[PDB]
Each structure stands twice: as structure tokens, then as C-alpha cells.
Design a protein around this ligand. Structure first.
Ligand code: HEC
Length: 66
């Protein structure tokens, strides 16, 4: 689906990290995102609801922005 990663990021990340083209995230990988969720960095533990496909789509979009 065109726009999936950016839409996911806008709904789940942007409130705390900025818009995707101006994001403050450093490590734009699935493992980095999953580690932050698991460690509840910034309260992100609630994002356990994301599938692995969705985290992939977010990380790909972030890495492409950039
Ligand atoms: C506020 C409730 C947040 C939401 C929603 C998301 N993030 Fe987050 N994240 C937040 C904080 C306060 C921190 C810690 C920064 C610090 O000073 O330690 C983080 C951490 C990350 C990280 C690791 C740090 C980095 O590489 O920049 C990543 C990779 C990350 N967060 C990604 C991320 C994603 C993909 C989100 C949407 C699924 C997301 N965060 C939401 C605060 C909040």
C-alpha cells in the first residue's frame, strides 16, 4: 500500500518524535524500534500493538526520509 509507512508513523510516532521528514529518531531500524518499545523508552511500551510488518514499514519510511 502506497503511503503505509508514513501513515503509520503519523498515527503512532509523530506526536512525540516530529513529522517524518523532521523526525528526531536516530536509529531507523526494526530492531531499534522494537528495543525502544520493549524498554518503554518514553512510554512507548503501549506500541506493542504494532505488527512486525508495520514496524518494517515505519523503519523503511524513516530511513528513506533521511
Ligand atoms: C511519546 C509517548 C512517544 C511516542 C508515541 C513514540 N516515541 Fe519513540 N521515544 C520517545 C522517547 C521519549 C524516547 C527516548 C529518547 C531518550 O532521551 O532516551 C524514544 C525512543 C525511541 C527510539 C530510540 C532512540 C533513537 O534511536 O532515536 C526509537 C528508535 C524510537 N523511539 C522510535 C519510535 C517509533 C518508530 C515510534 C512510533 C512507532 C515512536 N518512537 C513513538 C517518545 C515517544
Amino acid at each position: 500500500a502506497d503511503g503505509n509507512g508514513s501513515a503509520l508513523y503519523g498515527n503512532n510516532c509523530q506526536a512525540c518524535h516530529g513529522s517524518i521528514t523532521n523526525s528526531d529518531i536516530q536509529t531507523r531500524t526494526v530492531s531499534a524500534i522494537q528495543s525502544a518499545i520493549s524498554g518503554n523508552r518514553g512510554g512507548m511500551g503501549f506500541l506493542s500493538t504494532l505488527t512486525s510488518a508495520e514496524i518494517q514499514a515505519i523503519a523503511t519510511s524513516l530511513a528513506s526520509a533521511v
